[model samples]
Structure formats: C-alpha cells, structure tokens
Target: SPPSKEILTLKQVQEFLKDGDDVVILGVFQGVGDPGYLQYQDAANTLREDYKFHHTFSTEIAKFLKVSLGKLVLMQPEKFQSKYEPRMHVMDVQGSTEASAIKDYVVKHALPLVGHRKTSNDAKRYSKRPLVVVYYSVDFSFDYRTATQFWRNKVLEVAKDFPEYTFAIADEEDYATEVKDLGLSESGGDVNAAILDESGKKFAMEPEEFDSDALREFVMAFKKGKLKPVI
Candidate 1:
C-alpha cells in the first residue's frame, strides 16, 4: 500500500492529474455506505466542489446526494437496502464475495459515463492536446485480478480505437505480479513497470515519481496497438 493518509483535496487532485490522467484511491466505494463513507465521498465531492464534475446515479449514494451517478461517479462503496433499516446498508464487504458483482456493476453502470467524462475533460484540459487516460484502484491482487484485467483490457481496447487518448495506470503496487502479468510494464522497466510501444518506446509509467518529461515524450510518440489484446 502507498502510505495511507488523509485524502487529497479536490483542488490538489485536479492539479495532480493532467487532462486525461486517471487517479485511484483506497477505501472508496467500499464498506458501510454512509457518513462513515463520507470521507471517500468527500474526496469526490472535493472534485465536484472544485470542478463541478456534474454527474447523476441510479444507486443509493446518487439518490442520497441527489446526483445521477452518486458514488459510482466517485468510485466509492455501494449501498444496498438492509433488513434493519431495510434501509440499513453495509459499508464495504469482507474478502471477495462482492468482487464480481462490484466489477460488473462498475463496468456496466459506471465506466461508460466516466470514460466519456475523462476523455472530454482531458481534451478540455489539454486544449485538444493528446491526453493519456488515468485511473485509480486499490490492488492488482488475486481475488480482484479478473476485475483489474477487465478494466485494463477495456481501456486498452478503447485506446486502440481512440489513439488520441493514452491510458496510464497509477497505484502503489506496480510491482505486484498481477500488474506485471497485465503487460503494463515496458520490457526493461520492472519494479516500476511501464509499457513499450511497437517501436520499443515506453508509453506509461507505473508510479507518479517515475514519470519524467523525456519519458512522457517517448510515451506520446508511441502508436497504439493491442499488445496484450485481452489482458
């Protein structure tokens, strides 16, 4: 885990990300979905507060927030009706029982809107300049490997079709095996793995500090290709 601490302010998050960059956080959209989860929602709220990242949802968080996408837009935990409150809900789930359900829900309900917003935001941020896709996630471990693969493949596939936007994965565990297996690393670059384009130029960097101006140039020059097809 990349040293957990207080969440960044929306202004800080906005500044940290480039136009199309993706960002992820831990303990989001998981656990008891309420004011307890407010911190996580606060993270997204920060974004919306600063940037007016308008969105709506079809779930409780959305309903509660009176927004269309609710926590889905922010990647926060899902809230479900419970027996007690029938209205009561569980925050985050233990182990991986809800993994598939969560993944499917995000892919089917959340991602499309997010993808569109990311692309548009990136374009606006960069003045039509090419921007890479950015995303945040907790882990690239075993139980959630399938979910990780799905997002990676889906993003790559989308990138292939829309080369104007590149995709970059940022997280603490770039060295994790599942991530390495996803082919997110360039041939010579491990530990902080990255991807190499057809001409052997590296495209993405694993961690933030690893990214350099020169490296960014090289990544920008790489053409899109389906190297791992399906992750």
Candidate 2:
C-alpha cells in the first residue's frame, strides 16, 4: 500500500497529541531508507509548538525531533541548556543491547524525577510528565519480521518492569491511518503496507489472506475487564 490519501498535516498531529494520544513513529534507517522521516518531523514540529518537546527513539528521527523538543538528559542545566527552551519533555532509552540497562536507569533515575514533578504539580497537569522514547532498529531490508519481533519483545520486556507507567506501540498501519486521515498527499507515495514474517519476507495481504482475530478479540475483552492478566 502507498501512503494514504490523507496528508501529514501539522495541525492534525498536534490535535492528536493535545488530546492525549500516544504515537509510535517508525522509520527504515540511514538516509536512503525510512522515507516517512519527514512526516514524523512534521508531527513533532507541531507538537513542539504547544508541548515544548517531542520525544522519539535515538535515530535520525529522534535527532531531528530533538531539534524541536530539546534533548531531556542533556538539558539538565549542568550538562547542557537550551537557549530556545522546549514545550515537550524528551528522553532516550537503551536502543537494543542496553534494554536492561535502560530499564534500570529509568527505575532508579527517571522515575524519581517523575515522582518529584508529580508531587509539585496537580494531577491534571499532564503536560508536566516526560515522554521516554525508545528507538530500536530492526533490519527491514533482509529480515524485517524478525527484526520487528525482536524489537517488540525487547520493548515488552522493559515495559513489563514498569507497571506504573503506560506504554504504546506505534506500528506501520497506525502511521498509515494518520497519513491518510491528515490528507497529506505528495508524501504518501511508496508507503509499504506489506506485512513481513520473522525472516523479513514480505507477506502481502490478499482476499484469501490468513488472519488472526484471537489477539484482537483478547484485547477487546481485556479492555472490558472480562479477561484478566495471567498470574
């Protein structure tokens, strides 16, 4: 599938975030790959206008997003300070191998700051909360599926350890929906909707396509509180 008929408008993206929605921005890699980079930028720029910061994983996207959001860790007055100031809270986690390390750092360091901020602000002061963005790269060219699975597992592993905080996964389809919903034309071309297996092989969805409704059903049920997390 190509990029949706919807464009990536700054206003729409901003509205989504202001409404308290989590976004997962994924890109391919390097300069040649991950063409959706600019769309992510447009979204981040829009968010920064109001939120003061837009956090993302440590990648080309993250670096660019930082240009608007301002890097969190580095922004600690002693290490560095920004003359421009930001509207959003931004931070990075361990990319791949350092997942555990990253988790530990958050538990010991990040959580404390969050705790302090929460105490100083009202419960409704949502914007005061920081966004911890993790960037894990999966090799899409050769084995995209395996790469994505590995990344997901790693993210889940870390997320499981932090029950107090909420986490959201941004997938390609979500981005497609946003792209289409916003009505950004010129850039939606070359959008890939082809699903891949663990080996990075593309699995094109067709009329006779095999699908899984089990997970979907489970999620719906879980949200209704009919299903419980297994002990």
Candidate 3:
C-alpha cells in the first residue's frame, strides 16, 4: 500500500516548505458533511499517487481567513494566511466537486506558485495580466446590486474577450481601510471597482460609472496601452 496521508499543523506546514518544496495546504473545517473536507479527502487520495503532498485541516486558520466551512484553500507554504495571495488559491466546493474542475484549478492556480516558477514581480506572477478589483459591502439595506450584476455579466465576461486580465473581489467591510483609502466608500454606494495596472496603480470607478460600456472601453484602452489616469 502507498503511504497514508497525515494531518499537519500550520507550523509543520511552514517547516515542510522551508526545505524548498512547494506544499499544498488544504485549510478545512473538521466535519464529515463538509463538501470541501470530503472533496479534499478524495483529492488527497488521487493526488498522493502521483505527487508528494503535505496535507492538513486547519480550522483555526480557516476561520481566520473567513473561508466558509466547505471551501478548500490551496496555498503555498506560508507562516500566515496573510501571505496566501500571489502565493495561494481558493476553491469554493459547495457547488461542484467534479475532478476535472479541481484538476484544472490545481494546474492553473497552484502550479505557478511552486519552485522556479514563482516570481517577485506582481505582473510576472499573474503572467503580466491586468487585475480588476470589485469592492462591495454585503449588507442587507445597501444598494449597488446592479453594479455587482454588471460586474458579473460584463466585467467578468470580459475574460472571454481579453484572457490576459484577471479579476478579484474585496469586501468593503473586510478591507475597510483599503476601501476608505481608495475613496470607494465615499461614493455613497455599496459597491465600486478599480482597474489596476501591472504596477498596482488604481483607476477607480464609482457605482454609476461601473456600467458595461464603460468597463468595455476601459479594458480596450488598457489593452492598447492608451488608458489615461482617471483623476
């Protein structure tokens, strides 16, 4: 029989990565019904046959990262969750757990963080892709549902047209200081977005300015290297 997988702590995971191998730490809640936990078990079984992986269930870390109970966090070896991004990837397994999806995510997101492939430059880390950040506050009485929908329908779909740009979301409450500093909170709305160049400069947009046509034009201009600073 093959070697059985062991549960490791966050500290052990950090030490394991220090030896120079990229480790995939699966942060999950401890429960049988949790889809992320279940899928992780299956993935571990399937992956171990081919790769040497250090697996763990860190509910403490999961809660800290605000990962829902059933979501799987695929991250490179790091001492803390704050070091996750540009080095980690997340998968919400609540909706689907098809092997292909997991495999694809691992290939696309996780592989880049390992060994000689990792880079210090932000642009090179994302393969020189432009980044779009959508900021929203998830509150009941808050407005900006239309802005969020526009992002989902138009901004996100732009990936189909411009595959080089990547997108992410930042909750206003979760990143309160960043939202306020970016002036996203001063717009008297619940949602906003920014287009960030490879160097991490922001071209922010208000809720009303976040429509599909505006986003489309911005992306086009960005592609041509002709986008002007939004002052």
Top TM-score model: 3
- Whichever of 1 and 2 has more TM-score, that candidate is 1
Ranking by TM-score: 3, 1, 2
Where is model 1 poorest over a 10-residue stretch in terms of lDDT?
A: 77-86
lDDT of 2 at 32: 22
In the range 105-131, model 2's lDDT, one tens digit per residue, is 222322221111122232322232222
Question: Which stretches in model 2 have alpha-carbon errors above 4 Å?
Answer: 1-141, 146-213, 228-231
Q: Candidate 1 residues 1-231, lDDT tens each?
A: 112233334443334232323322223333344432444334334333223222211244334433332133323211111111111112342333243443333323222211322233533322222434334352445687466444444344434444444344344252345345545533344223244333323334434333334344434444434223213
Leading candidate by lDDT = 3
Reference-based TM-score, model 2? 0.19
Q: After superposition, how far is residue 192 of candidate 3 from its true place, in Å?
A: 1.3
What does candidate 1 score in Cα RMSD to the true structure? 17.1
Worst ten-residue run, lDDT, model 2? 74-83
Model 3 quality (TM-score): 0.41
lDDT of every predicted structure (CA atoms)? 0.35, 0.30, 0.53
Could you tally the backbone clashes for each prediction? 21, 16, 0
Measured on C-alpha atoms, candidate 1 has an lDDT of 0.35
